[PDB]
Design a protein around this ligand. Structure first.
Ligand SMILES: CCCCCCCCCCCCCCCCCC(=O)OC[C@H](COP(=O)([O-])OCC(O)COP(=O)([O-])OC[C@@H](COC(=O)CCCCCCCCCCCCCCCCC)OC(=O)CCCCCCCCCCCCCCCCC)OC(=O)CCCCCCCCCCCCCCCCC
Ligand code: BCL
Ligand code: BCL
Ligand code: BCL
Ligand code: BCL
Ligand code: BCL
Ligand code: BCL
Ligand SMILES: CC[C@H]1c2cc3[nH]c4c(c3C)C(=O)[C@H](C(=O)OC)c4c3nc(cc4[nH]c(cc(n2)[C@@H]1C)c(C(C)=O)c4C)[C@@H](C)[C@@H]3CCC(=O)OC/C=C(\C)CCC[C@H](C)CCC[C@H](C)CCCC(C)C
Ligand SMILES: CCCCCCCCCCCCO[C@@H]1O[C@H](CO)[C@@H](O[C@H]2O[C@H](CO)[C@@H](O)[C@H](O)[C@H]2O)[C@H](O)[C@H]1O
Ligand SMILES: CCCCCCCCCCCCO[C@@H]1O[C@H](CO)[C@@H](O[C@H]2O[C@H](CO)[C@@H](O)[C@H](O)[C@H]2O)[C@H](O)[C@H]1O
Ligand SMILES: [Ca+2]
Ligand SMILES: [Ca+2]
Lengths: 41, 44, 43, 277, 49, 63, 259, 49, 40, 43, 39, 43, 43, 42, 44, 41, 43, 38, 42, 43
């Protein structure tokens, strides 16, 4: 047990995914831009 | 019961507002610097 | 996202963030100075 | 954050310089006057090393490879004067910062010792390591007459300096003080393994046994080598061996070039030419 | 899984976020440093433009 | 009334401290003169450096 | 087989990388061992969080190991939960990291250099179960070496030079034969107090024991022993800590700074 | 095996989660390092494209 | 010892599915890698 | 054979065995890579 | 410290896991043999 | 911004700030002294 | 209380003096950089 | 600015300031000595 | 012979034996790999 | 608070700026003489 | 300035003062000896 | 240290400072005659 | 009085201190005079 | 000046002075022997 309430786990997980996909989306755009700049394969 | 940091709801909102305003100003100055850097010497 | 400050202590976060940013700023400037293509003090 | 038993020890006072001005803690660290001085001595020296790596020996050879970064001392032609920053002057500044940081660290340890009411053995012991560094970059270069005799600041480059200084005497193993220092280094490592083993084997005995006693400790090495130095004395011995190793290492390098210019094996000719044989 | 949220009952989110942020920062620095260490992808030394 | 130094410094430590300092300083200055070839009296009063001729060099080429 | 793993990779490069992974595990192991005492940390981070955030750093704490004591003295767990202890001091300033000023007489505060934990109220025992630290008057087989002076009878002198008392007996360690304490008959009161050998500088010529830690007047307040012929581990810490407090508290100038 | 789930009764699942993620990250880093060290599979210094 | 029986079954459900998702992405990456540069 | 686990702990045996098997697999793969006749990462 | 009944269950799963692990190993060695025989 | 002094204490923060500024000031001068085009002491 | 032991009034009072000291420092810096640019432009 | 002495103790600050000023003056003299155009002992 | 394991602990003796057997097996395999006449990975 | 009661701090500040301005004036004279000796800009 | 001797201990201040002057005197003599144009021990 | 001992020490300390200063100035005058540096 | 000394011995210690000082400096003066005549360094 | 013996131990200082002079006499002889201009055992 991590000291967190069970509702906090649901609420943290939702925000964690939103921040993770937002980070992942910026990464994917960066790699598309990087691929257009200089493809490596 | 206190949260994991002791900040209340209003305190966390109050810090977050100043944090994002400070973040926005820092990032805005950063964007201006990079535009000036690009005009001076484009790197790509 | 203002709830990140209910899990992370703002004081320690700001210390870690300000320190990382200062090191990052030094690092990027140093990298540019090490490249003759971008050393702005060469002339 | 402090240890769970530490708060009752965080007392005001005991500073050498500064009084209440810098008498505080930053996280676990005690700062004091020499924490402020030492930190910004180290910070400046570290940044100058990074700057020294940024310009490199020249633009062609410049590298951020951590093994290959090297801040070199001046040429010997600069003597004991100051060299231009890109021609060894940066090394001279970093050396000054290093001395400032090392001494401040020792003096900060003194203030901590005063706060805790303990002996000053640790800062005294650290002074031996500082003295060895001072011999390498100050005492020996001054005796030779040039700051360029100091070793370069580079993880691998200072090994090339050690290698070439050693071969300036054709066989450095024959240096008598060097032999003595190595003996102390090797004995200290043996003593440390023995002391670490004995404490661990007594407090972590075989399964199904209780913690052993100091009687077991004395008996164990009496059973092996016929003598036990004792729980207190092994720490005297360990401190003595480590400090003697560094003292004799400082002697060995400071006699190599200032007080002896020949090959080191030739130094033993005093013994070979004794009229007994 | 629709019950993937249960990971935050087992692992400490505060320590996990610190670890992932530290890992991601080091990884991002490492990849950039590796790219700059190659002749082909060093965007500062490539002479373009 | 210059005794006050002895009310704040022990006669014994200062006298030993003064002797160690004075002996060390005298040794240091004597060594500095020996360091300088002009004041190196251990070379003798009628010391003459070796004359070099026919393209001789005392030292090998440097850098 | 050969030395070349790939065009670039070779066996020595693999071996050094293998060491780095082992060494990383070793450092993690050693740091976890380091944290069997004093963790979780006493932090403001825990205090504002109401105890909901335990400060352990990285790596986290290890599972409690068991020390079975000899002579049925008990079993201790190296990582153990310790009740908070109040400090007889107050912060000199309200910012984090500020030091504390002891309350009352600093020599009696039990704070700073005069602080000590409460150890077990039992004597350290020899392998045979006898008390380890005992006076010479009960360890009759022990004696002072002939070439060394007998501490008994020597005048005990405080940091100021004023006479503090006389050495009545010598307490010795019956496991490793050595002096650990000097029983002093205090000149003022007459009540016997212990003086650790670590705070005693012998003057063989003058037959004087010089104690730079505390003044002669401070000897009256040295913590006393319950039983006259033995000392518990708790009492040992109390006595030694009291003298240590004098290294910072006995004289006003000892607080510093020098200049 | 109808009782593979019993692995989680003896060893703490939280430790496995971190250990598996840490182990896989190291294994992934190592294989990438090995491939980069090969002239055949180095995607940064092969000239393709 | 610690985790009970029911949550032990449930943990396996997300463990097996998430690991299977990782495995499937690995297979796709290796299929792509084989088309890019086969090694056998 | 089923009664082996009386002395050997099931849990510590698995981590010890898995760790042993893993480094064994690394060693065998690396030995083959060191062999030109079995290195699959070359031309 | 592990009783007999839970010992019976552990050995069955361990043998199944060992047999499952062995089977993958056998196929890999067969495929390796076809790819490049060593003996 | 004035709440920051309820997060960062003036005494410790000012000591860190002044030293970091002084070291930063020293570094930039040293960088310029190392750059031949901007070494004002070159003559 | 606060993380630093400073009240609302004390923090605001410190911030005022901090900001004017910061502004005077920045003003000298700006003049210094203008003079430096006139002496030897770098961009 | 007189209130800075209510943050930093003046008698302690003077010693710290003396060391800083002397160490800065030492550094500047050394930097000038490292520069041949401004070395006054040549 | 049925009187061998009343003194040697089954766990300790197997642990010592298993480590020794692996080391001997590793050593013999490495010796053969080091001998060109028995190297099975050399190509012939 | 260091115990300086806003009047001792004010009284010390007056002497501090006075000595500091004396030091700064001496420094300014030295830099003028240094510039007359060897200008650096 | 006169009551500074109550703030600063005359015994310890002097010991610091003479030590500083001795080191400063040694350093300047060392600097002159290191300077070839001001070395009075040469010819 | 009483104010009376502060008066005595300051007079001697200032007198010794001025004597050391005057001897220093004489030395620098002679050094300038021997070898000017500016 | 921190050296455990009275007002008498300090006075006579000082008188001997300067008396030894004067002789030692007198030998130093003569030594430097002879050294300057033998080989002046300035 | 007889009071110097009330300060310093006559026994210890006589051993120290005899020891110091003897070493001083040794080194000077050894230095002279090592100096060719003063070595008296060469011809
Ligand atoms: C083969 C040998 C060579 C191998 C390679 C060796 C390479 C050199 C090694 C160099 C090691 C340097 C690092 C040493 C520790 C640094 C100091 C420190 O902070 O320690 C805390 C750190 C973690 O402390 P903790 O107890 O977990 O902390 C509890 C909570 O985190 C407490 O919670 P918290 O809230 O306090 O957490 C914050 C904490 C977090 O700490 C960290 O993250 C630092 C550690 C990062 C690494 O912050 C700090 O500790 C530092 C505070 C600084 C505040 C001031 C910031 C100023 C910047 C602002 C500028 C803005 C402009 O302790 C260590 O890292 C120990 C490292 C031991 C290394 C030994 C292995 C190398 C030697 C091997 C030879 C020996 C023989 C082996 C057999
Ligand atoms: C280069 C030209 C000359 C030369 C130029 C000069 C000049 C110029 C001077 C000397 C002086 C000295 N020279 Mg010469 N000298 C030369 C060659 C030599 C040779 C040699 C064999 O080559 C020797 C042995 C000496 C020896 C000496 C000493 C007699 C004397 C140093 C005094 C001293 O050390 O007091 C320091 C040591 C003391 C013990 C002082 C005692 C006072 C204190 C208060 C006593 C305290 C006692 C207490 C117990 C402490 C004891 C010490 C500690 C326990 C360690 N010279 C060359 C040839 N020399 C100096 C002199 O004349 O001094 C009188 C001097 O000014
Ligand atoms: C050499 C030829 C190709 C290449 C061939 C391959 C092949 C073949 C593989 C990869 C795989 C990976 N490659 Mg690749 N790869 C190349 C060059 C790169 C470069 C680069 C800058 O050059 C980078 C940064 C990467 C990075 C990666 C990772 C995304 C991935 C392994 C991560 C891991 O260890 O997961 C382990 C750690 C974890 C934490 C996994 C967590 C598992 C969870 C439960 C499943 C869902 C993920 C969830 C959203 C959590 C996010 C974690 C994600 C893995 C990010 N590759 C070159 C160009 N690469 C592997 C892969 O696809 O793995 C996914 C793989 O099989
Ligand atoms: C080929 C070389 C290309 C290049 C190609 C790429 C590619 C491809 C990528 C980058 C990425 C990055 N590049 Mg790039 N990049 C180049 C040159 C540069 C230069 C330079 C001086 O030349 C710099 C400074 C950078 C810097 C960066 C970073 C902004 C970024 C990595 C961040 C990170 O590691 O986060 C890791 C650490 C954290 C995320 C911790 C921070 C926590 C934050 C605050 C979470 C906040 C939550 C928020 C609400 C939601 C998430 C949003 C995002 C965090 C923004 N690049 C050159 C020109 N670069 C990566 C990127 O875009 O990442 C976003 C990426 O994929
Ligand atoms: C190579 C081309 C240009 C150049 C291109 C760029 C580009 C592009 C950028 C910079 C940026 C910076 N450059 Mg530049 N820069 C050049 C040459 C220089 C030289 C020099 C002597 O040559 C110097 C000293 C600098 C210095 C700087 C810094 C002012 C700044 C990085 C600050 C930072 O890292 O904060 C990080 C450290 C901290 C945050 C710690 C501080 C903690 C304090 C107490 C809290 C402050 C936070 C505050 C509340 C909010 C911040 C923003 C505020 C609105 C001010 N540059 C060359 C000539 N430079 C960056 C910038 O503009 O950032 C704003 C940037 O993006
Ligand atoms: C040299 C010729 C071939 C090659 C020939 C072989 C041969 C022959 C073998 C392998 C094997 C392996 N190879 Mg290969 N392999 C090659 C190149 C590679 C490359 C690469 C990047 O080039 C990689 C990453 C691998 C990777 C692997 C591993 C997947 C595997 C070794 C795992 C291990 O060490 O177990 C140690 C770690 C463990 C045992 C931990 C336990 C993990 C598993 C999941 C245990 C689960 C038990 C059971 C299945 C549970 C489920 C039961 C049911 C529910 C009932 N090979 C080359 C191309 N390789 C071995 C193998 O097949 O093993 C599977 C093997 O015999
Ligand atoms: C380069 C041209 C000249 C020259 C140019 C100058 C110039 C210009 C000056 C000097 C000055 C000095 N020179 Mg010169 N000087 C030259 C060559 C020499 C040679 C030599 C053998 O070549 C020597 C030995 C000296 C020596 C000296 C000193 C007499 C004097 C510096 C004193 C000092 O620093 O006190 C500092 C140390 C103290 C005051 C105290 C020392 C005591 C100890 C060391 C400190 C310990 C602390 C103590 C225990 C405190 C106790 C408290 C008290 C008991 C109350 N010079 C050359 C030939 N020289 C300076 C001077 O005249 O000053 C008087 C000066 O301005
Ligand atoms: C004398 C006996 C041995 C010894 C003792 C010893 N060392 C000590 C101590 C003691 C008692 C301490 O108390 C002190 C300490 O706190 O240790 C944890 C310390 C210490 N010994 C250390 C290192 C160290 N000791 C060494 C040796 C030894 N130390 C001896 C063998 C070595 C060797 C042999 O190489 C090293 C590297 C530190 C971990 C620590 C002192 C930390 C310190 O001074 O911190 C302040 C300075 C900085 C944080 C950075 C300063 C950076 C500089 C400004 C620039 C760099 C200059 C440098 C010359 C670069 C050279 C690089 C190249 C050589 C690669
Ligand atoms: C360095 C570690 C810390 C030690 C602190 C002291 C550092 C050095 C002390 C400063 C001494 C400076 O002394 C000064 O040095 C330079 C450089 O040699 C001398 O310069 C002289 O030699 C150099 C090279 O040898 C020649 O290029 C130059 O033509 C000549 O004038 C000056 O004549 C001298 O005045
Ligand atoms: C944890 C780290 C694990 C690292 C991997 C461990 C397994 C690798 C073991 C390597 C053992 C090396 O063993 C020895 O290598 C050398 C050097 O190539 C070989 O030497 C041979 O190959 C070289 C290279 O082509 C040629 O010069 C020649 O054919 C021959 O000398 C020997 O035939 C081999 O017996
Ligand atoms: Ca480019
Ligand atoms: Ca490619």
């Amino acid at each position: 047990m991590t000291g967190l309430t069970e509702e906090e786990a649901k609420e943290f997980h939702g925000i964690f995914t939103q921040s993770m996909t937002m980070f992942f989306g910026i990464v994917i755009i960066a790699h598309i831009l990087a691929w257009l700049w200089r493809p490596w394969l | 019961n206190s949260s994991m940091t002791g900040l209340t709801e209003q305190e966390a909102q109050e810090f977050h507002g100043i944090f994002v305003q400070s973040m926005t100003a820092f990032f805005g100055i950063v964007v201006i610097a990079h535009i000036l850097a690009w005009l001076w010497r484009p790197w790509l | 996202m203002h709830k990140i400050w209910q899990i992370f202590d703002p004081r320690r976060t700001l210390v870690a963030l300000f320190g990382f940013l200062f090191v990052l700023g030094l690092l990027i400037h140093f990298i540019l100075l090490s490249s003759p293509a971008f050393n702005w003090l060469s002339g | 954050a402090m240890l769970s038993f530490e708060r009752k020890y965080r007392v005001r006072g005991g500073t050498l310089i500064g009084g209440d001005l810098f008498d505080f803690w930053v996280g676990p660290f005690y700062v004091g006057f020499f924490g402020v001085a030492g930190f910004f001595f180290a910070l400046l020296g570290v940044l100058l090393i990074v700057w020294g790596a940024t310009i490199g020996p020249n633009a062609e050879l410049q590298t951020y490879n951590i093994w290959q970064i090297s801040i070199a001392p001046p040429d010997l032609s600069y003597g004991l004067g100051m060299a231009p920053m890109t021609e060894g002057g940066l090394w001279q500044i970093i050396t000054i910062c290093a001395i400032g940081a090392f001494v401040s660290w020792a003096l900060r340890e003194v203030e901590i010792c005063r706060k805790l009411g303990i002996g000053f053995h640790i800062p005294f012991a650290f002074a031996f390591a500082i003295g060895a560094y001072l011999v390498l970059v100050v005492v020996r270069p001054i005796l030779m007459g040039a700051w360029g005799h100091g070793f370069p600041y580079g993880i691998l480059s200072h090994l090339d300096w050690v290698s070439n200084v050693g071969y300036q005497f054709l066989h450095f193993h024959y240096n008598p003080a060097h032999m003595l220092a190595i003996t102390f280094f090797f004995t200290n490592c043996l003593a440390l393994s023995m002391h670490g083993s004995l404490i661990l084997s007594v407090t972590n005995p075989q399964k199904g046994e209780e913690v052993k006693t100091s009687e077991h400790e004395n008996t164990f090495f009496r059973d092996i080598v016929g003598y036990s130095i004792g729980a207190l004395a092994i720490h005297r011995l360990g401190l003595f061996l480590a400090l003697s190793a560094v003292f004799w290492s400082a002697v060995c390098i400071v006699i190599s070039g200032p007080f002896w210019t020949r090959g080191w094996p030739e130094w033993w000719n005093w013994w070979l030419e004794l009229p007994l044989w | 899984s629709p019950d993937l949220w249960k990971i935050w009952l087992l692992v400490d989110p505060r320590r996990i976020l610190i670890a992932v942020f530290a890992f991601l920062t080091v990884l991002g620095l490492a990849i950039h440093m590796i790219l700059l260490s190659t002749a082909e992808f060093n965007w500062l030394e490539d002479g373009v433009p | 009334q210059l005794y006050k130094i002895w009310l704040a410094f022990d006669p014994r430590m200062a006298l030993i401290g003064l002797g160690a300092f004075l002996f060390a300083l005298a040794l240091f200055i004597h060594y500095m003169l020996l360091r300088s070839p002009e004041f190196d009296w251990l070379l003798g009063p009628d010391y003459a450096p070796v004359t070099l001729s026919a393209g001789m060099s005392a030292l090998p080429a440097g850098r | 087989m050969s030395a070349a793993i790939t065009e670039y990779m070779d066996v020595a490069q693999l071996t050094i990388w293998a060491f780095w992974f082992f060494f990383a595990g070793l450092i993690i192991y050693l740091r976890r061992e380091d944290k069997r005492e004093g963790y979780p940390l006493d932090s403001d981070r825990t205090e504002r969080s109401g105890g909901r955030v335990k400060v352990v750093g990285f790596p986290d704490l290890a599972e409690p190991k068991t020390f079975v004591l000899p002579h049925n003295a008990g079993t201790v767990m190296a990582p153990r939960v310790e009740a908070p202890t109040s400090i007889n001091a107050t912060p000199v300033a309200p910012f984090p990291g500020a030091p504390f000023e002891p309350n009352g007489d600093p020599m009696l505060s039990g704070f700073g250099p005069s602080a000590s934990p409460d150890r077990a109220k039992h004597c350290d025992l020899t392998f045979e179960g006898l008390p380890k630290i005992v006076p010479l008057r009960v360890a009759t087989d022990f004696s002072i070496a002939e070439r060394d002076p007998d501490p008994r009878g020597m005048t005990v002198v405080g940091l100021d030079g004023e006479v503090a008392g006389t050495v009545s007996d010598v307490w010795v360690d019956r496991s490793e034969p050595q002096i650990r304490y000097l029983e002093v008959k205090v000149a003022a009161g007459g009540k016997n107090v212990l003086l650790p050998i670590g705070f005693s500088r012998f003057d063989k010529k003058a037959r004087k024991v010089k104690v730079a830690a505390i003044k002669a007047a401070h000897f009256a307040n040295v913590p006393t022993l319950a039983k006259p012929d033995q000392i518990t581990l708790y009492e040992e810490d109390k006595v030694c800590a009291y003298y240590a407090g004098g290294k910072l508290y006995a004289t006003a100038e000892r607080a510093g700074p020098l200049l």
